[PDB]
Amino acid sequence: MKEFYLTVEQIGDSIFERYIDSNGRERTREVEYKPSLFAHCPESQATKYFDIYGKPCTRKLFANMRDASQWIKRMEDIGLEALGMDDFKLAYLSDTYNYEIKYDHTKIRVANFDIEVTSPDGFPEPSQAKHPIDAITHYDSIDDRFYVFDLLNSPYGNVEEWSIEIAAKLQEQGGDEVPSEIIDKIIYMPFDNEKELLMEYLNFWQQKTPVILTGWNVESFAIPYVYNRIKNIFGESTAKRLSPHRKTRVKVIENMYGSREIITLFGISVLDYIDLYKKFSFTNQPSYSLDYISEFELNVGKLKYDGPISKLRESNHQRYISYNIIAVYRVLQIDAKRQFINLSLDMGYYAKIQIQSVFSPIKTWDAIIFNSLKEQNKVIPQGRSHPVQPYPGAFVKEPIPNRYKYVMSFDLTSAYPSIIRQVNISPETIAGTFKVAPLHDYINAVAERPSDVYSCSPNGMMYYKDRDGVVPTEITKVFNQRKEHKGYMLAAQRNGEIIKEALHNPNLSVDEPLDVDYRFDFSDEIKEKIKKLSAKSLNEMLFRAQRTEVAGMTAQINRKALINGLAGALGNVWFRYYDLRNATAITTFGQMALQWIERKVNEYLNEVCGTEGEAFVLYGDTDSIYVSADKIIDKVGESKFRDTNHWVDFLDKFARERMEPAIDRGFREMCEYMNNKQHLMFMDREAIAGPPLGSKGIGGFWTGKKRYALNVWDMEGTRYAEPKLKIMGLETQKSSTPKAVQKALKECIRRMLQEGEESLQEYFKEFEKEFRQLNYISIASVSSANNIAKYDVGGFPGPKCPFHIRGILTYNRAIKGNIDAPQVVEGEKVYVLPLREGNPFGDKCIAWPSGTEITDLIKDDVLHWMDYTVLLEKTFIKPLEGFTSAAKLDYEKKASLFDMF
DNA sequence: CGCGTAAGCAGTCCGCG
DNA sequence: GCGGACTGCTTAC
Ligand SMILES: Nc1ncnc2c1ncn2[C@H]1C[C@H](O)[C@@H](COP(=O)(O)OP(=O)(O)OP(=O)(O)O)O1
Ligand SMILES: [Ca+2]
Ligand SMILES: [Ca+2]
Ligand SMILES: [Ca+2]
Ligand SMILES: [Ca+2]
Ligand SMILES: [Ca+2]
């Protein structure tokens, strides 16, 4: 097999590399790598090295890496560009792995761990590490084993050994219900003292050194806690044994308000799963506790116990340990679903970077672009300093707030990356400028043609047409991977709908789910067998189909995120190829494209309908259009349709056969107007929306920009067994809206769009009457809490104090003088409830850490003083009033002359 | 900590005769 | 009350 790196580090004048050798064995080496950098040279000087603009360069080979770094600094002192990859480990990987890397994940040691620390005096600060580590569970991917290190004797209690037999029993047998599928994979190690536990942990760590190190909050808590605890007990050199090169660094993580400390372990790639989830899941969660995220992702019940965690070990060590093991398994379960580890390895090896660098789109693109250019003996420019400057982005159309009955939507495939490829936007393809006319003049095709030579953007930029730039070339490669995975995702989604259909008529039989590849549309034979299956088998297939779809979604959406990130990187001052001319070339072309195609679709439909000046495009945002299809439907007349699916086919057919060719012609003209290199504006049909045939449903509504709802029957070729709501921006979609309020508002919208005004009025009356019985957590608002200190004036609200911050200060006063009972963490999320006039808390709201029950000290007082009236007006009635006025409906029945009999 | 901009709504402070 | 100036937060793309 071809070799591949696991980790790489620069330590002084040495490169330290852990790798898999040609025999699939893990090895480590230290290599005194001599880097090269570059300077411009005269043309009379013969070379094979050229900068990206075609100017000749001489290669400078250094005795060592520090020499190279010193040269860079001197070049700055002289005032001359020092060209080349200045991140030497990236150059080392490029020289050592000069081919497309094939990696074998089964050879990569992936460690998932969690620690427990009993603390009576509040949260155990990792930088202090003053309390004993009393449990460690460490899963090894190569062994497939959970290693449990259990402290029996502590200053906070001496306990009995954990029992695997009790751990396996049902909660209803007094057990811990540790999943039977991991019972035989647990390797249990009790210890009489903490010193021997840690000493044994480090020895195990040497034998089985993690390559990829993950778990939940391991980077901010577990890793620094273990390092600092070992440091405090044994000294620094022993703590540095967590790094296979015995090198570590305290890294200061700064943000807008304050900073925090992490421990960089050289030769380890830390991928904290919380950070993988936030980056790759495309959710925004009210809480990031592992129990909350596990509930969300896996529908597993919260890990339940009596008393605080600080008393759990001494009161129920059996459960304490089982829940530590379960915590580790839960992260593994989430990853089997979301596959964020697999994703990170794919992208990291593709770019030829340190795996943990997948967190940085700038670092990822820098390496992809460097490896690409290096292949043609081209030489990358020096990174430079730039002041942060604002620049313009997308166009969004102001919609007329209304109901809209029948709607069809269209948007560009991979908009910004497609703009890059079409126009040929790249640092090295800039050809010059042309004199710009107002954007309006290009939209309406009255402005002079920009160039008869070069490919243009309405921002004034011109680009070469003889050859692809490196940005277009490389963005195309990831785009293509993206397309493949999106293909698998959509097929699994369509397959899911077939299974849902079949479930209306399940057979009374005993059988198995079919062995199938859900990434590919079901053949007729499979469809035939499916209609003969039991409910049990069908459901399992549905679960498997939806897992495949999730796998497809992870692979495609994060590849889209990377290529969209290159467009954004052009407007980030730290990017090597930062250029506001290119960043604005993309966004400004996007503005034209949308408004151009809006004009064209309007013109085409006015012609089709024999009218003039009517707006068929009601809305659009960035790269998308929403077309009113009332007139298309009315031209055949609703009476002609058999059922809803009939008009859906008709609109589907109209979009494919009439709209899209019209749209394509409009864009091909635009491409020639701009003299672009290649036509790549592909605006495919997204949604087909309307009320159920025969109903009083309103179909859809818009309240303003980025705020709308549609009753969708077909989405990108997926025909749903049941209509699905596409809701954007409205309160049902915000993590700040109470859980139960999101649900009630969604149902109000369902009824508006599918059933009509009277159905909505019936539901509202019921919700208003019953909502006071909702559990307080379900009706609490949610907000991030930044700058709690800035607004704290002797424990009271200072000027301009945010409402959610006021709640926190109220909480702080009410718990003051409690070393136990949870503190609100700066920068994390809180639940917020209003309080009625004249409460014991002395203020109008209270906030507490999100994902948690409010501490029992004040819970009963909070519940008694919760302002249900304010809560209902603010989170439910006010948004609903917004929805219904836009849609020209009333959520309460008005008086009529019929009320007279 | 980690690519970009546009733009919505909650809330505070305060004007508005 | 409601809106504009402003801060804070969150979402659409
Ligand atoms: N998260 C983001 N980061 C940066 N730019 C974005 C992001 N989301 C959207 N954009 C910009 C770039 C996109 O190409 C453009 C259109 O957005 P959108 O339609 O959501 O994605 P897309 O057109 O790239 O892919 P798709 O083919 O799935 O429509 O808006
Ligand atoms: Ca724990
Ligand atoms: Ca798009
Ligand atoms: Ca059947
Ligand atoms: Ca879009
Ligand atoms: Ca599409």
JSON list of C-alpha atoms in Angstrom, two decimals, chain A residues 321-492:
[
{"chain": "A", "resi": 321, "resn": "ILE", "atom": "CA", "xyz": [-19.16, 4.88, 36.27]},
{"chain": "A", "resi": 322, "resn": "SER", "atom": "CA", "xyz": [-21.87, 3.47, 33.93]},
{"chain": "A", "resi": 323, "resn": "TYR", "atom": "CA", "xyz": [-22.77, 7.03, 32.87]},
{"chain": "A", "resi": 324, "resn": "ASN", "atom": "CA", "xyz": [-19.14, 7.84, 32.14]},
{"chain": "A", "resi": 325, "resn": "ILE", "atom": "CA", "xyz": [-18.97, 4.79, 29.85]},
{"chain": "A", "resi": 326, "resn": "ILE", "atom": "CA", "xyz": [-22.31, 5.71, 28.25]},
{"chain": "A", "resi": 327, "resn": "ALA", "atom": "CA", "xyz": [-21.15, 9.33, 27.64]},
{"chain": "A", "resi": 328, "resn": "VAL", "atom": "CA", "xyz": [-18.26, 8.02, 25.51]},
{"chain": "A", "resi": 329, "resn": "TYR", "atom": "CA", "xyz": [-20.47, 5.59, 23.56]},
{"chain": "A", "resi": 330, "resn": "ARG", "atom": "CA", "xyz": [-22.93, 8.40, 22.84]},
{"chain": "A", "resi": 331, "resn": "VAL", "atom": "CA", "xyz": [-20.31, 10.42, 20.95]},
{"chain": "A", "resi": 332, "resn": "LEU", "atom": "CA", "xyz": [-19.50, 7.27, 18.93]},
{"chain": "A", "resi": 333, "resn": "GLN", "atom": "CA", "xyz": [-23.21, 6.79, 18.20]},
{"chain": "A", "resi": 334, "resn": "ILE", "atom": "CA", "xyz": [-23.53, 10.36, 17.00]},
{"chain": "A", "resi": 335, "resn": "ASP", "atom": "CA", "xyz": [-20.51, 9.86, 14.73]},
{"chain": "A", "resi": 336, "resn": "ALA", "atom": "CA", "xyz": [-21.80, 6.58, 13.23]},
{"chain": "A", "resi": 337, "resn": "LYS", "atom": "CA", "xyz": [-24.79, 8.72, 12.26]},
{"chain": "A", "resi": 338, "resn": "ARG", "atom": "CA", "xyz": [-23.22, 12.05, 11.20]},
{"chain": "A", "resi": 339, "resn": "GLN", "atom": "CA", "xyz": [-19.80, 10.70, 10.14]},
{"chain": "A", "resi": 340, "resn": "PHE", "atom": "CA", "xyz": [-17.90, 13.92, 10.96]},
{"chain": "A", "resi": 341, "resn": "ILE", "atom": "CA", "xyz": [-14.64, 12.00, 11.68]},
{"chain": "A", "resi": 342, "resn": "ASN", "atom": "CA", "xyz": [-14.73, 10.35, 8.24]},
{"chain": "A", "resi": 343, "resn": "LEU", "atom": "CA", "xyz": [-15.46, 13.77, 6.71]},
{"chain": "A", "resi": 344, "resn": "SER", "atom": "CA", "xyz": [-12.51, 15.42, 8.48]},
{"chain": "A", "resi": 345, "resn": "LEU", "atom": "CA", "xyz": [-10.09, 12.69, 7.40]},
{"chain": "A", "resi": 346, "resn": "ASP", "atom": "CA", "xyz": [-11.30, 12.94, 3.76]},
{"chain": "A", "resi": 347, "resn": "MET", "atom": "CA", "xyz": [-10.86, 16.72, 3.60]},
{"chain": "A", "resi": 348, "resn": "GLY", "atom": "CA", "xyz": [-7.59, 16.78, 5.56]},
{"chain": "A", "resi": 349, "resn": "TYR", "atom": "CA", "xyz": [-5.91, 14.16, 3.42]},
{"chain": "A", "resi": 350, "resn": "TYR", "atom": "CA", "xyz": [-7.29, 15.79, 0.26]},
{"chain": "A", "resi": 351, "resn": "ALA", "atom": "CA", "xyz": [-5.72, 19.14, 1.20]},
{"chain": "A", "resi": 352, "resn": "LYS", "atom": "CA", "xyz": [-2.53, 17.61, 2.64]},
{"chain": "A", "resi": 353, "resn": "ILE", "atom": "CA", "xyz": [-2.82, 19.40, 5.99]},
{"chain": "A", "resi": 354, "resn": "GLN", "atom": "CA", "xyz": [-2.79, 18.58, 9.69]},
{"chain": "A", "resi": 355, "resn": "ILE", "atom": "CA", "xyz": [-6.22, 16.97, 10.18]},
{"chain": "A", "resi": 356, "resn": "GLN", "atom": "CA", "xyz": [-7.25, 19.54, 12.86]},
{"chain": "A", "resi": 357, "resn": "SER", "atom": "CA", "xyz": [-6.80, 22.21, 10.18]},
{"chain": "A", "resi": 358, "resn": "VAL", "atom": "CA", "xyz": [-10.13, 21.19, 8.57]},
{"chain": "A", "resi": 359, "resn": "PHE", "atom": "CA", "xyz": [-11.55, 23.73, 11.05]},
{"chain": "A", "resi": 360, "resn": "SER", "atom": "CA", "xyz": [-9.92, 26.50, 8.97]},
{"chain": "A", "resi": 361, "resn": "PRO", "atom": "CA", "xyz": [-11.15, 27.04, 5.34]},
{"chain": "A", "resi": 362, "resn": "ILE", "atom": "CA", "xyz": [-8.26, 29.51, 4.80]},
{"chain": "A", "resi": 363, "resn": "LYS", "atom": "CA", "xyz": [-5.62, 26.94, 5.81]},
{"chain": "A", "resi": 364, "resn": "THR", "atom": "CA", "xyz": [-7.40, 24.22, 3.76]},
{"chain": "A", "resi": 365, "resn": "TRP", "atom": "CA", "xyz": [-7.53, 26.30, 0.56]},
{"chain": "A", "resi": 366, "resn": "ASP", "atom": "CA", "xyz": [-3.98, 27.63, 1.06]},
{"chain": "A", "resi": 367, "resn": "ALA", "atom": "CA", "xyz": [-2.69, 24.04, 1.04]},
{"chain": "A", "resi": 368, "resn": "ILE", "atom": "CA", "xyz": [-4.90, 22.85, -1.87]},
{"chain": "A", "resi": 369, "resn": "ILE", "atom": "CA", "xyz": [-3.82, 25.84, -3.96]},
{"chain": "A", "resi": 370, "resn": "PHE", "atom": "CA", "xyz": [-0.14, 25.42, -3.00]},
{"chain": "A", "resi": 371, "resn": "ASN", "atom": "CA", "xyz": [-0.04, 21.72, -3.96]},
{"chain": "A", "resi": 372, "resn": "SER", "atom": "CA", "xyz": [-1.80, 22.53, -7.26]},
{"chain": "A", "resi": 373, "resn": "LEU", "atom": "CA", "xyz": [0.62, 25.32, -8.19]},
{"chain": "A", "resi": 374, "resn": "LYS", "atom": "CA", "xyz": [3.67, 23.39, -6.99]},
{"chain": "A", "resi": 375, "resn": "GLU", "atom": "CA", "xyz": [2.81, 20.70, -9.61]},
{"chain": "A", "resi": 376, "resn": "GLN", "atom": "CA", "xyz": [3.44, 23.19, -12.41]},
{"chain": "A", "resi": 377, "resn": "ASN", "atom": "CA", "xyz": [6.63, 24.50, -10.72]},
{"chain": "A", "resi": 378, "resn": "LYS", "atom": "CA", "xyz": [4.72, 27.69, -9.88]},
{"chain": "A", "resi": 379, "resn": "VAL", "atom": "CA", "xyz": [5.49, 29.71, -6.76]},
{"chain": "A", "resi": 380, "resn": "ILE", "atom": "CA", "xyz": [2.91, 31.10, -4.33]},
{"chain": "A", "resi": 381, "resn": "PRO", "atom": "CA", "xyz": [3.02, 34.79, -3.28]},
{"chain": "A", "resi": 382, "resn": "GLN", "atom": "CA", "xyz": [3.88, 35.95, 0.25]},
{"chain": "A", "resi": 383, "resn": "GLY", "atom": "CA", "xyz": [0.95, 36.53, 2.60]},
{"chain": "A", "resi": 384, "resn": "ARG", "atom": "CA", "xyz": [0.50, 40.26, 3.24]},
{"chain": "A", "resi": 385, "resn": "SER", "atom": "CA", "xyz": [-1.13, 42.64, 5.71]},
{"chain": "A", "resi": 386, "resn": "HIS", "atom": "CA", "xyz": [-4.55, 44.12, 4.90]},
{"chain": "A", "resi": 387, "resn": "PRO", "atom": "CA", "xyz": [-6.85, 46.42, 6.84]},
{"chain": "A", "resi": 388, "resn": "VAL", "atom": "CA", "xyz": [-10.35, 44.94, 7.25]},
{"chain": "A", "resi": 389, "resn": "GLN", "atom": "CA", "xyz": [-12.72, 46.70, 4.80]},
{"chain": "A", "resi": 390, "resn": "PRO", "atom": "CA", "xyz": [-16.47, 46.15, 4.31]},
{"chain": "A", "resi": 391, "resn": "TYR", "atom": "CA", "xyz": [-17.64, 45.00, 0.86]},
{"chain": "A", "resi": 392, "resn": "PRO", "atom": "CA", "xyz": [-21.04, 44.40, -0.81]},
{"chain": "A", "resi": 393, "resn": "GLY", "atom": "CA", "xyz": [-22.75, 41.04, -0.99]},
{"chain": "A", "resi": 394, "resn": "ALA", "atom": "CA", "xyz": [-25.96, 39.63, -2.42]},
{"chain": "A", "resi": 395, "resn": "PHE", "atom": "CA", "xyz": [-29.21, 41.19, -3.65]},
{"chain": "A", "resi": 396, "resn": "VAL", "atom": "CA", "xyz": [-32.43, 40.33, -1.84]},
{"chain": "A", "resi": 397, "resn": "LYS", "atom": "CA", "xyz": [-35.79, 41.36, -3.34]},
{"chain": "A", "resi": 398, "resn": "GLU", "atom": "CA", "xyz": [-38.34, 43.15, -1.11]},
{"chain": "A", "resi": 399, "resn": "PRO", "atom": "CA", "xyz": [-41.49, 40.99, -1.38]},
{"chain": "A", "resi": 400, "resn": "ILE", "atom": "CA", "xyz": [-45.05, 42.26, -1.16]},
{"chain": "A", "resi": 401, "resn": "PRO", "atom": "CA", "xyz": [-46.26, 40.76, 2.12]},
{"chain": "A", "resi": 402, "resn": "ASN", "atom": "CA", "xyz": [-49.17, 38.48, 1.23]},
{"chain": "A", "resi": 403, "resn": "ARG", "atom": "CA", "xyz": [-50.47, 35.00, 0.85]},
{"chain": "A", "resi": 404, "resn": "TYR", "atom": "CA", "xyz": [-49.25, 33.31, -2.33]},
{"chain": "A", "resi": 405, "resn": "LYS", "atom": "CA", "xyz": [-51.27, 30.27, -3.45]},
{"chain": "A", "resi": 406, "resn": "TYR", "atom": "CA", "xyz": [-49.23, 28.36, -6.07]},
{"chain": "A", "resi": 407, "resn": "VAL", "atom": "CA", "xyz": [-45.46, 28.84, -6.11]},
{"chain": "A", "resi": 408, "resn": "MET", "atom": "CA", "xyz": [-42.49, 27.43, -8.00]},
{"chain": "A", "resi": 409, "resn": "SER", "atom": "CA", "xyz": [-38.95, 28.25, -6.98]},
{"chain": "A", "resi": 410, "resn": "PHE", "atom": "CA", "xyz": [-35.66, 28.04, -8.80]},
{"chain": "A", "resi": 411, "resn": "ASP", "atom": "CA", "xyz": [-32.07, 28.67, -7.76]},
{"chain": "A", "resi": 412, "resn": "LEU", "atom": "CA", "xyz": [-28.52, 28.41, -9.05]},
{"chain": "A", "resi": 413, "resn": "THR", "atom": "CA", "xyz": [-26.55, 25.23, -8.47]},
{"chain": "A", "resi": 414, "resn": "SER", "atom": "CA", "xyz": [-23.48, 26.09, -6.41]},
{"chain": "A", "resi": 415, "resn": "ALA", "atom": "CA", "xyz": [-23.96, 29.79, -7.14]},
{"chain": "A", "resi": 416, "resn": "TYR", "atom": "CA", "xyz": [-20.72, 31.48, -6.04]},
{"chain": "A", "resi": 417, "resn": "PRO", "atom": "CA", "xyz": [-18.43, 28.61, -7.15]},
{"chain": "A", "resi": 418, "resn": "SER", "atom": "CA", "xyz": [-20.25, 28.53, -10.48]},
{"chain": "A", "resi": 419, "resn": "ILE", "atom": "CA", "xyz": [-19.70, 32.32, -10.81]},
{"chain": "A", "resi": 420, "resn": "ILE", "atom": "CA", "xyz": [-15.97, 31.73, -10.14]},
{"chain": "A", "resi": 421, "resn": "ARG", "atom": "CA", "xyz": [-15.73, 29.10, -12.87]},
{"chain": "A", "resi": 422, "resn": "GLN", "atom": "CA", "xyz": [-17.91, 30.91, -15.41]},
{"chain": "A", "resi": 423, "resn": "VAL", "atom": "CA", "xyz": [-16.11, 34.28, -15.12]},
{"chain": "A", "resi": 424, "resn": "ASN", "atom": "CA", "xyz": [-12.72, 32.64, -14.44]},
{"chain": "A", "resi": 425, "resn": "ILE", "atom": "CA", "xyz": [-12.01, 34.54, -11.17]},
{"chain": "A", "resi": 426, "resn": "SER", "atom": "CA", "xyz": [-8.56, 33.86, -9.71]},
{"chain": "A", "resi": 427, "resn": "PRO", "atom": "CA", "xyz": [-5.59, 35.88, -8.42]},
{"chain": "A", "resi": 428, "resn": "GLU", "atom": "CA", "xyz": [-3.55, 35.18, -11.57]},
{"chain": "A", "resi": 429, "resn": "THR", "atom": "CA", "xyz": [-6.24, 35.61, -14.24]},
{"chain": "A", "resi": 430, "resn": "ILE", "atom": "CA", "xyz": [-6.92, 39.31, -13.65]},
{"chain": "A", "resi": 431, "resn": "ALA", "atom": "CA", "xyz": [-6.55, 40.97, -17.06]},
{"chain": "A", "resi": 432, "resn": "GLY", "atom": "CA", "xyz": [-7.50, 44.53, -16.12]},
{"chain": "A", "resi": 433, "resn": "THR", "atom": "CA", "xyz": [-10.54, 46.74, -15.67]},
{"chain": "A", "resi": 434, "resn": "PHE", "atom": "CA", "xyz": [-13.33, 48.32, -17.72]},
{"chain": "A", "resi": 435, "resn": "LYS", "atom": "CA", "xyz": [-15.41, 51.44, -17.09]},
{"chain": "A", "resi": 436, "resn": "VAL", "atom": "CA", "xyz": [-18.52, 50.48, -15.12]},
{"chain": "A", "resi": 437, "resn": "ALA", "atom": "CA", "xyz": [-22.09, 51.64, -15.65]},
{"chain": "A", "resi": 438, "resn": "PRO", "atom": "CA", "xyz": [-24.77, 51.45, -12.96]},
{"chain": "A", "resi": 439, "resn": "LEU", "atom": "CA", "xyz": [-25.71, 47.84, -12.17]},
{"chain": "A", "resi": 440, "resn": "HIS", "atom": "CA", "xyz": [-29.26, 48.60, -13.42]},
{"chain": "A", "resi": 441, "resn": "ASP", "atom": "CA", "xyz": [-27.84, 49.21, -16.90]},
{"chain": "A", "resi": 442, "resn": "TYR", "atom": "CA", "xyz": [-26.37, 45.69, -17.08]},
{"chain": "A", "resi": 443, "resn": "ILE", "atom": "CA", "xyz": [-29.49, 44.09, -15.57]},
{"chain": "A", "resi": 444, "resn": "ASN", "atom": "CA", "xyz": [-31.53, 45.72, -18.33]},
{"chain": "A", "resi": 445, "resn": "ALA", "atom": "CA", "xyz": [-28.91, 45.08, -21.06]},
{"chain": "A", "resi": 446, "resn": "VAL", "atom": "CA", "xyz": [-28.58, 48.78, -22.00]},
{"chain": "A", "resi": 447, "resn": "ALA", "atom": "CA", "xyz": [-24.94, 49.23, -20.93]},
{"chain": "A", "resi": 448, "resn": "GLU", "atom": "CA", "xyz": [-22.09, 48.93, -23.42]},
{"chain": "A", "resi": 449, "resn": "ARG", "atom": "CA", "xyz": [-20.62, 45.45, -23.73]},
{"chain": "A", "resi": 450, "resn": "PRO", "atom": "CA", "xyz": [-17.71, 45.39, -21.19]},
{"chain": "A", "resi": 451, "resn": "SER", "atom": "CA", "xyz": [-15.14, 43.50, -23.29]},
{"chain": "A", "resi": 452, "resn": "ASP", "atom": "CA", "xyz": [-14.71, 41.86, -26.68]},
{"chain": "A", "resi": 453, "resn": "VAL", "atom": "CA", "xyz": [-11.57, 40.12, -25.34]},
{"chain": "A", "resi": 454, "resn": "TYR", "atom": "CA", "xyz": [-11.92, 39.23, -21.68]},
{"chain": "A", "resi": 455, "resn": "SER", "atom": "CA", "xyz": [-14.46, 37.58, -19.39]},
{"chain": "A", "resi": 456, "resn": "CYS", "atom": "CA", "xyz": [-16.17, 40.19, -17.22]},
{"chain": "A", "resi": 457, "resn": "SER", "atom": "CA", "xyz": [-18.03, 40.94, -14.02]},
{"chain": "A", "resi": 458, "resn": "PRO", "atom": "CA", "xyz": [-20.25, 44.08, -13.57]},
{"chain": "A", "resi": 459, "resn": "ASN", "atom": "CA", "xyz": [-17.94, 45.26, -10.79]},
{"chain": "A", "resi": 460, "resn": "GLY", "atom": "CA", "xyz": [-15.46, 46.45, -13.48]},
{"chain": "A", "resi": 461, "resn": "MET", "atom": "CA", "xyz": [-13.11, 43.43, -13.49]},
{"chain": "A", "resi": 462, "resn": "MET", "atom": "CA", "xyz": [-11.82, 41.55, -16.54]},
{"chain": "A", "resi": 463, "resn": "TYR", "atom": "CA", "xyz": [-10.25, 38.07, -16.59]},
{"chain": "A", "resi": 464, "resn": "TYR", "atom": "CA", "xyz": [-8.22, 36.00, -19.09]},
{"chain": "A", "resi": 465, "resn": "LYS", "atom": "CA", "xyz": [-9.99, 33.48, -21.29]},
{"chain": "A", "resi": 466, "resn": "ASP", "atom": "CA", "xyz": [-7.05, 31.42, -22.61]},
{"chain": "A", "resi": 467, "resn": "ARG", "atom": "CA", "xyz": [-6.70, 29.22, -19.52]},
{"chain": "A", "resi": 468, "resn": "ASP", "atom": "CA", "xyz": [-8.38, 28.31, -16.24]},
{"chain": "A", "resi": 469, "resn": "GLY", "atom": "CA", "xyz": [-7.12, 30.01, -13.09]},
{"chain": "A", "resi": 470, "resn": "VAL", "atom": "CA", "xyz": [-6.00, 27.86, -10.14]},
{"chain": "A", "resi": 471, "resn": "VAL", "atom": "CA", "xyz": [-9.08, 28.90, -8.09]},
{"chain": "A", "resi": 472, "resn": "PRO", "atom": "CA", "xyz": [-11.55, 27.77, -10.82]},
{"chain": "A", "resi": 473, "resn": "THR", "atom": "CA", "xyz": [-9.54, 24.56, -11.36]},
{"chain": "A", "resi": 474, "resn": "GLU", "atom": "CA", "xyz": [-9.46, 23.55, -7.73]},
{"chain": "A", "resi": 475, "resn": "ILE", "atom": "CA", "xyz": [-12.95, 24.71, -6.81]},
{"chain": "A", "resi": 476, "resn": "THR", "atom": "CA", "xyz": [-14.30, 22.58, -9.74]},
{"chain": "A", "resi": 477, "resn": "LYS", "atom": "CA", "xyz": [-12.63, 19.45, -8.26]},
{"chain": "A", "resi": 478, "resn": "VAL", "atom": "CA", "xyz": [-14.37, 19.78, -4.87]},
{"chain": "A", "resi": 479, "resn": "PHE", "atom": "CA", "xyz": [-17.62, 20.89, -6.60]},
{"chain": "A", "resi": 480, "resn": "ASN", "atom": "CA", "xyz": [-17.58, 17.62, -8.55]},
{"chain": "A", "resi": 481, "resn": "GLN", "atom": "CA", "xyz": [-17.12, 15.56, -5.39]},
{"chain": "A", "resi": 482, "resn": "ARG", "atom": "CA", "xyz": [-19.98, 17.60, -3.88]},
{"chain": "A", "resi": 483, "resn": "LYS", "atom": "CA", "xyz": [-22.28, 16.70, -6.77]},
{"chain": "A", "resi": 484, "resn": "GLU", "atom": "CA", "xyz": [-21.58, 12.96, -6.46]},
{"chain": "A", "resi": 485, "resn": "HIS", "atom": "CA", "xyz": [-22.53, 12.98, -2.76]},
{"chain": "A", "resi": 486, "resn": "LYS", "atom": "CA", "xyz": [-25.59, 15.15, -3.23]},
{"chain": "A", "resi": 487, "resn": "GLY", "atom": "CA", "xyz": [-26.65, 12.58, -5.84]},
{"chain": "A", "resi": 488, "resn": "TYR", "atom": "CA", "xyz": [-26.42, 9.81, -3.24]},
{"chain": "A", "resi": 489, "resn": "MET", "atom": "CA", "xyz": [-28.27, 11.98, -0.70]},
{"chain": "A", "resi": 490, "resn": "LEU", "atom": "CA", "xyz": [-31.24, 12.73, -2.97]},
{"chain": "A", "resi": 491, "resn": "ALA", "atom": "CA", "xyz": [-31.54, 9.08, -4.09]},
{"chain": "A", "resi": 492, "resn": "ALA", "atom": "CA", "xyz": [-31.70, 7.97, -0.42]}
]
